[PDB]
Structure formats: structure tokens, C-alpha cells
Amino acid sequence: QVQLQESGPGLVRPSQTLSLSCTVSGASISSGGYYWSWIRQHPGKGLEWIGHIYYSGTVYYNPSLRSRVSISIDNQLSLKVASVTAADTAVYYCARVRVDSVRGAGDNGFDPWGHGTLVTV
Amino acid sequence: AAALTQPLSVSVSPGQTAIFTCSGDNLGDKYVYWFQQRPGQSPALLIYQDNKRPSGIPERFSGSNSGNTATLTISGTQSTDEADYYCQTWDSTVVFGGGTKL
Amino acid sequence: AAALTQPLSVSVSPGQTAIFTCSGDNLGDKYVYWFQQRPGQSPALLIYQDNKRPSGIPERFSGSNSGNTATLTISGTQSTDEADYYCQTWDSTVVFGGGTKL
Amino acid sequence: VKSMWSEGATFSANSVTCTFSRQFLIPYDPEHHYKVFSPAASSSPIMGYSTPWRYLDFNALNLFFSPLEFQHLIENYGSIAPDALTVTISEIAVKDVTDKTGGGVQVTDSTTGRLCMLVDHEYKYPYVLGQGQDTLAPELPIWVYFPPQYAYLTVGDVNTQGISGDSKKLASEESAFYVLEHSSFQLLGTGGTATMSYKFPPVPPENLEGCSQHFYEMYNPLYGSRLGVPDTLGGDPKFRSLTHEDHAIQPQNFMPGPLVNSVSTLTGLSTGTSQNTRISLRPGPVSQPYHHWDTDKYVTGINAISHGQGVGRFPNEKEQLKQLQGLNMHTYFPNKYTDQIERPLMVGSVWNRRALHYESQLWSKIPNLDDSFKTQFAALGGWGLHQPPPQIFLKILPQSGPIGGIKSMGITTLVQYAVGIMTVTMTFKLGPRKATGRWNPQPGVYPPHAAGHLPYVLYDHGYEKPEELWTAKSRVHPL
Amino acid sequence: YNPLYGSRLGVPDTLGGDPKFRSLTHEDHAIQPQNFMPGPLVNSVST
Amino acid sequence: LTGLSTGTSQNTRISLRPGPVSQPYHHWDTDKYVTGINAISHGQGVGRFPNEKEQLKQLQGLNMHTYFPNKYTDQIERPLMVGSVWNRRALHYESQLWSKIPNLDDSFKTQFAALGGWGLHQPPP
Amino acid sequence: VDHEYKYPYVLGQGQDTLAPELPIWVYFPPQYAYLTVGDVNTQGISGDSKKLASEESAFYVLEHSSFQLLGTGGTATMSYKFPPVPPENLEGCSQHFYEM
Amino acid sequence: HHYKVFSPAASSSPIMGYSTPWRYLDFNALNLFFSP
Amino acid sequence: LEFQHLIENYGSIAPDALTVTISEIAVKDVTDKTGGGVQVTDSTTGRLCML
Amino acid sequence: KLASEESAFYVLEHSSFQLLGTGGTATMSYKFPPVPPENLEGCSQHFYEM
Amino acid sequence: PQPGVYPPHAAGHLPYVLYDHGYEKPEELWTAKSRVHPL
């Protein structure tokens, strides 16, 4: 089994760098083809996707939140969303997708999720 | 497609089915994934690749994907399926749906 | 196919029909056999080769096999048809179904 | 006129003509775009283009030869080199789906749809055929080929835009956008046929025969040596002569070949910047083994490729462990001993090759940049040549109705797909087997297995390939 | 190579006598196996 | 002693004794004769070595180090260095004529063997 | 005469049986022998290895051939023709290559 | 006129040979064709 | 690329010939699936008046 | 009975295949060897009473 | 692949080859039916 545990800093309102981390238990992350996503969910609204990253540095982002967030890997799965003048606090999940074969359409979905952390802003 | 359409909420009784709609442009030639999010918990991969179910998901969930829509059919809904169901595709990044509140 | 799908139970009243589903991959190009197991007794061959009935089985049982499913239709269910109905095929060994509890 | 599905090899004392046939399927593209990329690496990123075309990749050797025909190839001949190649696209049945809306799919047949076929005889478009990727052909002639989508990488201009370190290769003046619809296009409707007819350059053979002699032991085991070997060092040499027992200090007139990072058990051996850019040169050069059999077990190397499965499917290079190569082979220098793992080129040298096997490539491509050495034989198996067999690109067409005058009625790409048959023939100039006045029965030619699980045969998708690769050097030369 | 489609061959994961090779996806660009090496760079440095 | 040598850890160690053909093993420096580790004696002992004065001239010789300004690193091995010229070890009155290039493939350069001589595919039978 | 190169070639390795240097002495030609590749075992007490015969090992009996039987007074020839080989340039240099 | 394989039996890759009852001849060197 | 090759190599331009070929024509008809809406078969009797 | 080295897996798709579409025709044209006849006539005499 | 053609032996003692009158023949005879017909 593979489980994903998060790390929540708490709450900072006046525009500081929101830092998170997701240590993966059960299997290492530099062991093959698996994306590592960061997914939001507003309380009372649908899910929202920030971006995912491969272990070799390549990272896809959301086009709406492109110039604010930053995913990184030091076997930690960090997230460094800044410019929090818009009060988005919602919820931060971690999720893993198996990398598809043809690169065109997604062959797999987010089967192992994290437990979820509640950030406040 | 790049913007998935999904209604607000559905109403059901025990002993019947509840079929939802996940509209989208050219969604028949795409993969749609369903996620079961019980309240207070993370979502779980309910139905993947429009027909299949994993081992942790019971054999009462089934879906479809035809034309410009993708449905999720629950056969014999129990008193534990009151959960937000989201449809998710891949229009080259990731596209999440709105969510049918059950 | 090698794994037959069948729901848990169905609910019916006297004076109508109760149609079950025996799902399966490429079940249209296969033979499906239905078995009537009253409680406390062995099963009996209800409907064989998707349409036919033996002499011991009355003429109110009939089935079908089209596409990826095979149905069993009871015409005018009486107060003695409350029995587990199993669908059975041959995917080169034998494949038994789950059973619709009536 | 007769329409035939051709398959089978015909041997001679000269060349063998081996043809195969598969059923291909040009699937669909709901968008005929070009779809650049958006990689956006963060640590030199990549930059590509996704063409809406389908090429086909018949590169490997296990398609032209049946296992019986490969066994007949190994036990009878002593060389192999290709000299001709024709690719015929047989009967085409481009058809259209009508979307039964309650059934879902109903496939009629279309006589007005076509299949755009382009052959790149001028090498105008980038060549992605010979790199060893998981879309080649079915190994058995009963399965259906799905040909891969065409795409390529270019060179752009690396920027740094983001928050922390986000790089992205944007388009430069050197970047290129090859639209394949600026070409000649055999349009190739229903029932049409088309050919390619390539002719291979003169390539050196692959010598499917081992050696019954070590290269460093080619002397008379008696009689000693006419020359001498030092005894004392430090300015007063005092050389002594040799007897017949001096085998570890016998003077050789030819050195062994290079062993640049041959070790045993990430990135392997790798060039690049400081510690993290580090692109991999994974399966070594062609002069090195990455799997053989030492006295107890199988040694497997850092620089190995798996060819499947995991545990791995590696070719047993027993003909490199013989002639002074191998994995843990250090070289020693008496400099004021220095254990080195790298061995240099050493002007007179012989290193025979990494052996070809049943599933190896045939060509890759030597890149258009100049001053190659030696590059007559590529890694991952195969030859590798300037002007390789050209790529056959296969789009279908975007038939784009209906409209109604103003409206965007229907789907406007309606839906179409094309099935067909590709019959690929290739002739291999075989050389005669080398002579031996041997008197011993040579070892038999059978693919390696362990116990119970036999090689290529159906079992209770059924058909299973062996654990080790079926190499091609099993008869002796005699050097 | 084709930027899609991965690679037919494998790359090691564990070392020390028990290899346990794994396959590749299309994102494995830094460990893609090349059939031709680069040329020599005998004392290429900067100032 | 074994000279320069390949092989396993420290004791298998077969010798590649008279170097490649691109190297001298005996010449004359300013005072004496320098005689090398990788030399063969051709008789006698004290030895009978060919005086390779035409390799000491063109930037070869025995104690010839190469230097690199990497952040100098004294190296004794010099690489092939894509544009290069190294003329040969000279033939003499008692040298060989051919040896044999072995039947294993991909030779470089092997047109001239060590111990003197040419060395050729299909030698005199 | 082994024109087909069927048997292993042990001629050009530099061993102490070539010919007399002066034409008055008598040549004693050497005995033919060769090394092969076998299969290394380890049988003994401490560490004794021994290369036994394998399937790749070969036993070239030379009496499976054509044999000019060549009695008393007989003559026999070989007549080899050398391949095109590069010359040996028996001339030095009056100039350093780095000083040109 | 035997063939007389070998019995080296090294102890530390040994050798393995065959001793043919034949005589070859080795005119390899240069000092035989040329007088001084 | 061809316009760049035109500018950097020549010093004048003037047209002198023009042919317009209307290639393979596939006049087809929609059958109005009434529940799907549109189903396009192919028509061999329909034509395309070209003047 | 598992597969041995003498066991064989004849895939019939390694052959020449008249593909033979709609309306097509194909022939075989075998020629029998010289075989002894079947003599469709009994006997009016016992062989031991001749 | 048809089965390979090699004379039968058991272990270590190889077929026709000289050993330390030397030359030894295998334990079983080398029969001639080793490829298949296919009947």
C-alpha cells in the first residue's frame, strides 16, 4: 500500500509564501513513472487542480495559477503558492497519476490520494 | 473538453438508480474518471476509463461515455452513497468537473 | 465471459414481470444457462441455450441473449418463484454467476 | 490478378528474401492540430510538435524471421547484411462510423474517404524511427498493428520565467515547424496500393559465428618466446628470456579494445553539467558487454538495457568475455599499481562487437553532423547508416461535413478510420560459413530456456518469449 | 526520438547484484538510451 | 612485473607487454639510454633494443607527461586527440614481417602489428 | 598447406624457433600445437583450477585433409600473394612536427 | 603419433591445448631474406 | 521559407500562367437521424455544377 | 502433456493466402496417384472349392 | 525452433574429443532422427 501524508503551516493572511510538503510512504517517488499532483477543493464548490510534477524536474501547471504557484521535488513534493491577496485557503490534497503511454489522453486517474490539509487565509 | 459541464444536485430514494450527466464537447473520444468524495474525507477513484472499477470499489458502480456526455449509474443506491461525484478528463493538462451533490 | 456480472436482489409483486441482468463481455456469442434454486433444494435447469425450456419447467419462463447481456424474463410470477436464479456460461471451463435473489 | 498475403523467408547459398505481412489501422484524430508542447521543466527542457500523422516502424529482426527461420539462419551461415527493402501497402478499406445513438457505433464502408500516404525519400522531415520505443509491430502475424503517431523534438531557446526556477524551451530562429502537408501525397483510396522500394547501402556484415580461441592466446603453447621481459627496475634493467610456462607475460602484438565505464551493479554513465543536468548514454558503446556469465552467476552491469520485463531480458555476450573484455576488467599501470577501470583505444586494437540477437534492431540512423567514428554499427543492435529506410507517413483525411449553409452541423470531421495490410520484404546478403577442420560436433542452435517453460510456443497472450535473448554467435570461427 | 511512446528497453533501479529493471515512460528524457555517443573533449574547460 | 596489463583484481593480469605500435620503449636522452617498462629484449642479460630516435623527435618518448589546467594535473597517459600523428615504432633488421589480425571484428588500426611486421587478414599459410 | 585457414594460426607471435640466421646451419622446424577455449572448473583441495573441454573447444585432427604425400626426391610449392599493405617508409625526418 | 591434450592444472584461468604430431615452418623474420 | 528564398535570390516577379484543377469530388447527402440529428451517407447521383 | 522440443505450433498465417474477396474464385486441381481398383464384383465360387 | 543436433552426453565427459586412447565416444549412441516431419 502507498499512503501520502501532508504538512500544513497554519494561517498567514498578509501575503507570505504558502509552503506545503507531501512525504510519500510505501514507495519512493524516484522509482519510475508517476506524476504527483496538488489538488484544491473549495468548501461548497468543486475540485481544482494546481499542477503535477515528474521526478526528473518537468512540471505542468494550471494556466490560471501559472505565475503564482511552484511545485518542486526534493523527495518532499513541495508547493510554494505566493501572492495570497486573493483569499484562497480551500484545502490541499496530494494525488498520484500513472504516466500514460501515448502522451495524448490520460490513461490513468488519481488513485492514491492524500489525507488533505486545511490551510486558512 | 476544456470545460466540463455538470449539474448541481440530484435527488434519489433507496431502491432505484441515480444517473448523472457530465457534458462536454467531443467527450466520446476521451477518458472520463469519476471520484467519490464522502464528506470529511479525500476523494477515491470510483470509475476509471468510463467502464472499469478497481477492487476497493464495489460492483454496483458503472458508467458510460457516448457522444458529448458521460454518465455514472449507481445500481441500488444505499444509505452511504450521499457523496459529491466529480467527473475528470484530460484536455492536455487536467479538467475537473463541477460535481453532482448526492 | 470469464467473469459474469449479476446484481444482488430484485423486488416484484404478483401480476407483473421481473427481468434480471447477467452482464458479461461478448456474451451474445455464447450460451447462457439459468438455474432455479429454491431454498433447501438443489438447483434445476430452468432455461437452457438462451431460449429453450425442458418439459419439467413450465411455459412461463423465457430468456434472451443479446450483445453483452442475457436476461431471464418471468411472465406472471407466482408465490413459488422466490428462488435464487444463477446464470452460467462456458468460458472453456465453466463460469457461474452471482445470483439474483428473488 | 490475384491478391495475396505474402509471408515467409526463402533461403539460398546467396541472400535470403524474408517477407512478412501485418494488418495496420490508422485510427482517428478528432483534432488535426499540431499541438506544440508545454513541458515547463524546473530543476534544458524539451520542445516538440505533435503531427497528426502515422508512420510505421518495422525495425526489429524478429519480424522478418520466424524462430525456425532464425535457427536455420544461425546454424547454416556465417554473416548477414541487408541489401534491399520494399514496403507495399495492400488493400485499403477506409470506412466511417455512423454513431447509432442507442447502439453507439455502426461501421459502414466509405468509397470517398482516402488515406494520405507520404514517403520521405528526400529526408526533409526528422527521423524518429530507430531509437527503440514500444511501438514496432506484433511479433505474431495474427495481431493487428497500430502504427504510432508522428512527433519530433527540435532546438529552441531556453528561458527562465516563473517564480522559483521554471525553465521553458520556447521557439527560436533555428526551431522548425515541419508541416507535412507541403508534399506530394499518394492519396490512395479504397483498394489502392503503394510501394516504397528502398535499396540498402553497402554495409559490413554481422558475422554470426563465435571463436574457438582466445585472441591473447594465439601462440604455440610450447617453445617460449624469442623476446625478453624485465626483471630489475631502476635504471639497471637486466632482461631475462622466457620459457613456455610464461603465459601471463607473453608479449602480444595486438591490444584489446576500449572499456569506457564497464562495471557491475542512477543514469549510468553520463555527460552533462555539474551533477543534475546529466543526460544518459545508457547502453555503452558497441565495444562493451553489459551481461555475461562468470564462474557462479550472471553479472549484469550498470550500463545495461532490459529489452523487456522486472528481472530483465539480457543477451549473453559470451564472445566478449572470451576476448579480454567483460564487466569488472581493470587495467593496470606501473606508474610511480594504478587500478583504472577505463581502458583507452590503444592504436592496435580488436574488440569484436556486442552480438546481435533475435529481437535486435536493424538500422538506426547516423546523424547528419560530421566526422563520425566508427558508427558503422549502432548500439541497441542494428547497423545504423546515413540515408536510412525512409519513413512512410499515413494520415487519413479531414473530410469535414456537413454545414447547411451557415450552421456548424454535425461533427465536421465526421468520423473515419482505415484498415489495411502492409507487406514488407527485405533481402539479406548472407555470407558462407567459415571453414573449420574441426572434427568436433559444433554446439547446437536452440534458444535458451531454464526448465519447463519452453521457448516460442503457445501455452495455456499465451505465446511466451524466453528469459534470455537468443544471441547469434553459437558456432566457432576458429580464429 | 519520438517525444511520446517511451522506450522499449529498460533502466536499472536497484544495484548490488539484484538489478530489478523497470520500463520507461515518455517523460524519461534524461535516461533515454542512445545508440551513438558524443565525441572526445580532451581538456575542455573555461577560464 | 607484468608491465601494463588488463585483467581482474590484482593477480590474473595478462600482459600487453610491448605497448601499442605508437610508442617507443628505448631511445637516447641527454646522458644515457632510457629503456622503459614495456620493452622487449629481442635477445640477450642486458637486452638488444632498437633505438627509436624518430619517436623522441616528434613529441613522443618515455617520460612524456601531459598537463591540464583543470582546477596542473600531471597525467602520463595521452589520449587519441582527433587530429593526431604518431609516426610508428621503427622496423629493424631482425623484425617480423606479418603476424595475423584475429578474426574478431572491428579492428583499429591493426595495419601494423607490434613486435615488428605488418599483420594482416589472411596471412601466409 | 592450409590455404583455407581451417586450423589455428600460431606463426607470428615471436618464439624461439624461426630459422638459422646464417645459411650454413640446419633448420629444425617446430612442432605444431595450439591453445583453445574450454570451461574452467575448480576441483582439487585448496584452489586447483583446470580448463576442461567444452562444446566450444575444438580438436583439429590434421589428417582430415589432402596431403601431398611427397616421397623421396619430390617437390612442392605454395605460391602465396600478399594483400595491398601500406609501406614502412624507411626514412626519418629532418624537422620536428611541432616546429614547422 | 598421439595428440596429447595437456594437464596444466593451475592454482592461484588456466590453459588448454593440443600437441599435434606435425611440423610447421616459420620464416617470419626479415634477417633471412636480406644479407647485411 | 519559399518567400524568403524568393526575396534573397531574385529581383523581379511577374505571373505568366495559372491552372485551377478541382480534384476528387464527394457530393454526399444527410439523412436526418431524428434522434441523432445527422447521418451522412454518400450520394452517387448528386452532382456539382461548375461554371 | 506439456510442450516439448518436438512439439510444434503451426501458425497458418506464415503462408501465401489467396485473399479472395467478394465474387472471387479459386481452384485446387489435384491429381490422384495410381491406385489399385476396388473390384465391385463378388464371386460365384468358393476359393477352397475350385 | 527445431531441437538442436548434438550427440548425447551426461556431465563433464564431452563427446568425441581428446582427453588426458584419449579419445572417448559417448555413453549412448548418436541416433539420426532429431528433426520432425510433421507426419
UniProtKB/TrEMBL annotation, chain E:
Which domain of life does the protein's organism represent? Viruses
Q: Where in the cell is it found?
A: Virion
The species this protein belongs to is Human parvovirus B19 (HPV B19)
The identity of this protein, by name, is VP1 protein
Q: So what family is this one in?
A: Belongs to the parvoviridae capsid protein family.
From TrEMBL, chain J:
Q: What family does this chain come from, according to its entry?
A: Belongs to the parvoviridae capsid protein family.
Subcellular location(s) per record: Virion
- Which protein is depicted? VP1 protein
Q: Which residues of the full protein are shown?
A: 430 to 479 of 781
TrEMBL record, chain K:
- What are the start and end residues of every segment in region (Disordered)? 21-39
Subcellular locations according to the entry: Virion
The family line of this record is:
Belongs to the parvoviridae capsid protein family.
Annotated protein name in UniProt: VP1 protein
Entire protein: shown range? 732 to 781 of 781
